[PDB]
């Protein structure tokens, strides 16, 4: 949601 943090992070 809202977009993606690679490494530390999340993806939605």
Same mark, same amino acid.
């Given at each position: 949601?809202?977009? &993606?943090?690679?490494?530390?992070?999340? &993806?939605?």
């Amino acid at each position: 949601h809202x977009x &993606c943090i690679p490494x530390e992070x999340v &993806c939605x």
